[PDB]
């Protein structure tokens, strides 16, 4: 039940497409209270992203069905669809809160003062999962999770502008998700487009100095950025 076999079990679960078990193994590895290496960090990220993404896809499907069953006016049908959507939503919220607890209690806390890369990574994760909580929240709790995601994204972006290269995939993904938060969560297309274009231009300014692998990793996220930019018009 040691760290090596836990990481191996996470890799196994990934190969077996069983991402709940992968997330559980990486949660145990994180609960060992020791800092995570880049490989363990990426394994945890992939596991919990796949879990939350499955829950998000199910929630999207059921909510899209609910929006039409509501316009049709069937009482029992809309009641059952709403109940199932709430079930999937509670699952999604539980996964998100599990990730946020792992971040606040273990991951962000054990970051050294000079570990700006891990700080940006974990704050981006916090912002992403609070945004996922915002996708399903209504009322004052929606504003609360929006403020949490905003603070996480802003802190991560400041640390990233100070200590990370514009072409680093972590910074590019942070800027992409921050712009998506501005556009889809805040309905603020101006600052969303501004941040996305600023990130794209800062990456263009140094794209020539990248290795092949770095070039590919950065250009993928830059493609995502310019696709989101073209979409926002």
């Amino acid at each position: 039940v040691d760290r090596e076999q836990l990481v191996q079990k996470a890799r196994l679960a990934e190969q077996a497409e069983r991402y709940d078990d992968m997330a559980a193994a990486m949660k145990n590895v994180t609960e060992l209270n020791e800092p995570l290496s880049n490989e363990e960090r990426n394994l945890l990220s992939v596991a919990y992203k796949n879990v939350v993404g499955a829950r998000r896809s199910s929630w999207r499907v059921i909510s899209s069905i609910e929006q039409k069953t509501s316009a049709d006016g069937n009482e029992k049908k809309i009641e059952m669809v709403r109940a199932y959507r709430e079930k999937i939503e509670k699952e999604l919220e539980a996964v998100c809160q599990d990730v946020l607890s792992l971040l606040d209690n273990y991951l962000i806390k054990n970051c050294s003062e000079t570990q700006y890369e891990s700080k940006v990574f974990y704050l981006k994760m916090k912002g992403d999962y609070y945004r996922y909580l915002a996708e399903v929240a209504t009322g004052e709790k929606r504003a609360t999770v929006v403020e949490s995601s905003e603070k996480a994204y802003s802190e991560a972006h400041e640390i990233s502008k100070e200590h990370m290269q514009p072409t680093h995939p972590i910074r590019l993904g942070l800027a992409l998700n921050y712009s998506v938060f501005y556009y889809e969560i805040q309905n603020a297309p101006e600052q969303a487009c501004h941040l996305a274009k600023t990130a794209f231009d800062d990456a263009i300014a140094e794209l020539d100095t990248l290795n092949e692998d770095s070039y590919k990793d950065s250009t993928l996220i830059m493609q995502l950025l310019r696709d989101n930019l073209t979409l926002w018009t």
Partner: peptide, 6 residues
């Protein structure tokens, strides 16, 4: 459409 994320 939905905005592309990470």
């Amino acid at each position: 459409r939905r905005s592309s994320t990470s």
